[PDB]
Amino acid sequence: EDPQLLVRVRGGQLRGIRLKAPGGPVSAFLGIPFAEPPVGSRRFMPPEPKRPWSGVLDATTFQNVCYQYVDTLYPGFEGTEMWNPNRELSEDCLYLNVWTPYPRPASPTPVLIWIYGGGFYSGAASLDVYDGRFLAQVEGAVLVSMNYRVGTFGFLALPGSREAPGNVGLLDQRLALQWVQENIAAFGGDPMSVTLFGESAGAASVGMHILSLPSRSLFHRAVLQSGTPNGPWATVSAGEARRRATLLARLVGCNDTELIACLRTRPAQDLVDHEWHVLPQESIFRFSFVPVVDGDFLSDTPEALINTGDFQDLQVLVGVVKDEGSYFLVYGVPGFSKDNESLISRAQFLAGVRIGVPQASDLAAEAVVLHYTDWLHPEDPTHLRDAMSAVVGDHNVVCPVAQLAGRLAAQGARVYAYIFEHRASTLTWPLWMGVPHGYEIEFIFGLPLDPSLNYTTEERIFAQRLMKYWTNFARTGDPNDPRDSKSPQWPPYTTAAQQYVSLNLKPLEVRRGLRAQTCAFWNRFLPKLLSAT
Amino acid sequence: EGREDPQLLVRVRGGQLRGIRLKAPGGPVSAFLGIPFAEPPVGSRRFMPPEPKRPWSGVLDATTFQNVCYQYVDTLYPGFEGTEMWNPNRELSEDCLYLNVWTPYPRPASPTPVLIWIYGGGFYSGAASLDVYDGRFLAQVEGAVLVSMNYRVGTFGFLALPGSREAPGNVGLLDQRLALQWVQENIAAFGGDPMSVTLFGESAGAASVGMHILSLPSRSLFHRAVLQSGTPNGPWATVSAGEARRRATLLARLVGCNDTELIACLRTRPAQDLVDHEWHVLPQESIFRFSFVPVVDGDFLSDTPEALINTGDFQDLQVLVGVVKDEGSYFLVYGVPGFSKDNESLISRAQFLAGVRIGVPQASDLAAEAVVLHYTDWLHPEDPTHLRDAMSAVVGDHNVVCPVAQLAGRLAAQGARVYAYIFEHRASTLTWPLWMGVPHGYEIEFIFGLPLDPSLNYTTEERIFAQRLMKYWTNFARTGDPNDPRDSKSPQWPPYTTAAQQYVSLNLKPLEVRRGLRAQTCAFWNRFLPKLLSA
Ligand SMILES: CCN(CC)CCNS(=O)(=O)c1ccccc1F
Ligand SMILES: CCN(CC)CCNS(=O)(=O)c1ccccc1F
Ligand SMILES: *[C@@H]1O[C@H](CO)[C@@H](O)[C@H](O)[C@H]1NC(C)=O
Ligand SMILES: *[C@@H]1O[C@H](CO)[C@@H](O)[C@H](O)[C@H]1NC(C)=O
Ligand SMILES: *[C@H]1O[C@H](CO)[C@@H](O)[C@H](O)[C@H]1NC(C)=O
């Protein structure tokens, strides 16, 4: 019985496992229950604290993945399968994971808490890309990741109802945050230095904890990678949420109480089978069951809340990858595929815009086409292809990120912004997709340090730089290495100067204006245009 | 005659003329100035189509410029060369339908290509007698036969009650046309070739040239065309019949006046009374908008110029079009608060938003917002220097650059041979401040070859530049191609096409080929803006 792997938390004793990282051992405590299993009458319900247990709970292995849709686009293809569930699916899935250095830290150590993405319909803390052993070993970090309910199980809402109030997946996240406050000291973590970080829907989740009062005592700093609470996909109105929930009910043979009672009788896969039939338009980068603006978890729209808050106590690191939109084109836009260069016609570009901007009126669509067309070469297939990616990337990620950065900075927050531009040498997607949504993550987590993965020696060094930025931020609220010069320094993002840095193999380069002209179009003009219809 | 210069005596259809021997720097030229081409459009003839000049007896003296058509005189900067150079330099009169002819001395023995200049001035002003339109240099250096005519402007030339007999509209354009017909009949007497006639004009004159391209009865009267900083399409060059009627009746009201009775009352009014009130009839506070302009009538123009350049077969057409570097700047000091020739005109964001409403008076709030969105530098949204230059760009692109780009692309798509330029040289002699750059109208002195005048103090390099441009223009007039065939050495000027969109830069450096005439920005003005107005 290794006493380094034996921990007492409030619920009882745990036994972890000594894992090997390339440079030494780490302590891993995997599959710790933080909630009562949300099964049976508990489906759609807020999470309840896990009851205490007897003896020593085995925490040597990952627990089940929250029940979710599984991707079938490219079966066997690593580019897609890397995101697919790597453990059995179950509604019994509210478990978290803790990596610490071996042996347990001598002094209280800053905690990083990872919240996975996956469009609020998918994801798991057990994925190889979220492996916290490298950060734990190299940077001495205490890293936590939790599973949270996704899809209908996490976000089906009949706003106002008792039995499906909505946002329970976010409440799963919050309960794990509370668990960290109560228990992390036993692992050598400092509950007074907690940094949330996440990507895509996980970044949006991080943003919603910033905007939700009861979450504010649970962390001190935040990193939002390629995702925001504001924007076109991260939330729905109460009316649209109810609309989608009732439609789904009808589809599966089902007042709120009776409707939800019937839904709870249905096998999990029946719900998943019909998850995608409730979207109002044919679209991409749009998800059926996402957080709802209810007046509860969120007192108002994220756009409203980031515009009025006092965020002076907040430090935030936000950024995007070079090609945010490319991943999504192969999943719905005719003409795109990972198996060719996806050179498209102008008719295909126009068709793609209606799909990429599903809420657009004819005039709004024309405006987007006008902005992104190269009028010198308006029929060039290479430009039209890359512009289609830009439309989806800017609309859904880059410009909402720029807006969040600008808004938070204006309201007194300390903001650092980045663009991640390095394409992994081991990338399995074709060249035209560039640096796609999600492909900075393997570097932040230090996967190039894994000798079995065949990253270049430059990529190993690049990864260590990023781990240092991230952990320095967690420690200080400042990614800058507090012992360096001639670097150059990573300056805070401001509304005026709008400074951000490029993250690639080259040293930091300071740039100004995050797609400033283009994002002014998306953030300022487009809503006017939709309002006028 | 008998004791006079026998080389200055010429007969035309109306009778005998006596011209004058002028000195140009390289030698003498023949000038026949103030030749009447119409009966004076006075009294009962006011607002009426011109009637051909009835033959006169004896030898008419054609040695001096004639009257300027009655018009508003500019008062913004008294005694300032920058404005006064455009002001009338002869007596203002409704008796103003006269034309001028410059030829080599002695007159060419073989038929010589003819250039016909049509002045601009927003259809409310201008004269063929201005020093910047002096035809002696083109005549002497290039051997050109150059003709320029006065045409009625303002109410006198363009007040219209569409459908009426007594004020049918577009009579200023009919004046121009009558002059073209005069050239067809008489220019051979001067050594000119009526089978090789090239029209050129700037601003409203360029728009006029475009009207003649689009009007059927003008089409046998010329063979090639040059449009400098002006087009028949666009927001200022024409008004609808309903708006022309609206403006005419309002003007009538303002001077104390059934169309026949209204026009009859208008004819009793002193010329100056019409001028004193002509600027009170614009529907909005604006710049680059003129009260009395050509009207879309179904007659002179069978449809809007926009429709006409979209459906025509223009295979027979060779056309040279272009713009200057800073089309918008001149207009800012005349209507937008914060702008002046006497300071650097750095403006606030509030002054920029207000200027946009004035520079785009037809715009709804949403359209104006779109313009502001497009022209703002969102990295420095309140930078006064950028806002000032952006305001200029808004006015220049909207009124000139993008209508020119549209005209070039449309005509080329319909089969025409198009050559396009941007003129980027600022004269060393320019009296306007530096922030205005190369303003509307300031390529003209170079085309006409004024730098060749020793007394004007242009640089040696500017003299050479001027001679280059005169060659481009006369080559085009002669052949429909501005390039010199014997010079395969010097950079070639390629035709503008929709596919490649090639145009050249005109400056002190050799020709440089560029592609896309403000492609993104003009796509906004030409394609999107109209959609936005409709919604
Ligand atoms: C979490 C990183 N992410 C980065 C792409 C991969 C995971 N899938 S997804 O939800 O984003 C998604 C979107 C569209 C189509 C399929 C799909 F899985
Ligand atoms: C014909 C050359 N043009 C080139 C500028 C100078 C003549 N003035 S204008 O009609 O264009 C004009 C416009 C606005 C305000 C005053 C004004 F005279
Ligand atoms: C790429 O692949 C898809 C499906 O495989 C196809 O529809 C598309 O036409 C291809 N692109 C080409 C042929 O340019
Ligand atoms: C320049 O002059 C104009 C006209 O007098 C005035 O409106 C403007 O405020 C002046 N600008 C500056 C910076 O002095
Ligand atoms: C140029 O020559 C001299 C400069 O010394 C001056 O007297 C004359 O007025 C100038 N001419 C013009 C048109 O500026």
Selected residue of B378, B386, B406, B525 to mutate for chain A interface (largest A Cβ count, 10 A):
B378
CB-ligand 2 contact for B472 (6 Å cutoff): no
Give the DSSP letter of residue B383: -
Identity of the amino acid at A477: G
Q: A109-115 and A142-146 as β-strands: parallel, antiparallel, unpaired?
A: parallel
- Find the catalytic residue in A209, A274, A395, A437: A437
User: B382: nearest CA in chain A?
Assistant: A496
Question: Which H, E and C letters describe B162-195, residue by residue?
Answer: CCCCCCCCCHHHHHHHHHHHHHHHHHHHHCEEEE
> Which ligand is the nearest neighbour of the Cα of A381?
3
Tokens of A449: 């340090």
Rounded distance between C-alpha atoms, residue B327 and residue B517, angstroms: 14
Chain breaks in chain B (C to N over 2.5 A) after: 257
Question: Which among B378, B520, B531 has the least Cβ separation from residue A375?
Answer: B520
- Residue B114's closest CA among B32, B223, B219, B228? B223
CB-count burial class (<10 Å; 0-12, 13-18, 19+) for A318: buried
Residue B482: phi, psi to the nearest 5?
A: -70, -15
- Residue B317's closest CA among B186, B392, B410? B410
Rounded distance between C-alpha atoms, residue A195 and residue B146, angstroms: 80
Rounded distance between C-alpha atoms, residue B231 and residue B321, angstroms: 9
Instruction: For CA atoms A70, A73, A78, A80, give the dihedral sign.
Output: negative
CATH of the domain at B363: 3.40.50.1820
Question: Which among B373, B522, B523 has the least Cβ separation from residue A521?
Answer: B373
Contacts of A513 in chain B (CB under 8 A): 378-379
Tokens of B174: 């009919």
Which parts of B397-496 fold into alpha helices (H)? 402-413, 444-447, 460-479
End-to-end distance of chain A based on CA atoms, in angstroms? 68
Q: Which of B330, B332, B334, B341 to mutate to test the pocket of ligand 2 (most atoms within 8 A of CB)?
A: B330
Counting DSSP H helices and E strands in chain B, the numbers are 18, 16
Give the DSSP letter of residue B360: S
Residues, chain B, total?
A: 535
- Find the catalytic residue in B327, B443, B445, B462: B327
Q: How many CA atoms lie within 13 A of A474 on its CB side?
A: 26
Identity of the amino acid at A349: F
Give the DSSP letter of residue B436: G
Which residue's CA is the closest to the ligand 2 atom numbered 14? B331
- Find the catalytic residue in B229, B425, B440, B445: B440
A508 in Cβ contact with A487 (< 8 Å): yes
Query: Cis omega (within 30 of 0) on the bond before A75?
Result: no
A47 in Cβ contact with A94 (< 8 Å): yes
Contacts of B369 in chain A (CB under 8 A): 525, 528
End-to-end distance of chain B based on CA atoms, in angstroms? 71
How many independent structural domains does chain B possess? 1
- Edge-to-edge strand ranges of the sheet holding A12-15: A6-9, A12-15, A56-58
Ligand 2: atom nearest CA of B334 is: 15
Give the DSSP letter of residue A423: P
359-418 in A: which are within 8 Å (CB) of B?
363, 366-367, 370, 373-376
- Residue B129's closest CA among B114, B144, B102, B150? B150
Selected residue of B372, B373, B522 to mutate for chain A interface (largest A Cβ count, 10 A):
B373
Rounded distance between C-alpha atoms, residue A203 and residue A196, angstroms: 9
Rounded distance between C-alpha atoms, residue A359 and residue B52, angstroms: 64
* CA–centroid distance, residue A351 to ligand 3 (Å): 15
- Residue A186's closest CA among A10, A43, A434, A328? A10
Could you confirm whether A437 is annotated as catalytic?
yes
- Edge-to-edge strand ranges of the sheet holding B59-61: B9-12, B15-18, B59-61
Q: How far is CA A273 from the centre of its chain?
A: 24
Could you confirm whether B240 is annotated as catalytic?
no
Q: Is B146 helix (H, G, I), strand (E, B) or coil?
A: strand
Question: Which among A367, A375, A520 has the least Cβ separation from residue B378?
Answer: A520
Place of tokens 């209908």: A152
Task: Tell me the residue range of the domain where A36 lies.
Answer: 1-533
CB-count burial class (<10 Å; 0-12, 13-18, 19+) for B489: exposed
Chain breaks in chain A (C to N over 2.5 A) after: 254
> Which ligand is the nearest neighbour of the Cα of B457?
5
Which residue's CA is the closest to the ligand 3 atom numbered 5? A337
Q: How many CB pairs under 8 A join A and B?
A: 43
Contact criterion met (CB < 8 Å) for B373 and A533: no
Q: Is B499 helix (H, G, I), strand (E, B) or coil?
A: coil
Residue A370: phi, psi to the nearest 5?
A: -60, -45
Which parts of A44-167 fold into alpha helices (H)? 78-81, 133-139, 151-155
Rounded distance between C-alpha atoms, residue B262 and residue B246, angstroms: 13
A355 in Cβ contact with A372 (< 8 Å): no
Could you confirm whether B505 is annotated as catalytic?
no
* Residue A521 near chain B (CB below 8 Å): yes
B226 in Cβ contact with B473 (< 8 Å): yes
Q: For chain A, percent helix, then strand, then coil, each to nearest 5?
A: 35, 20, 45
Q: Which residues, in sequence order, are CB contacts of B353 under 8 Å at separation 6+?
A: B368, B372
Identity of the amino acid at B520: Q
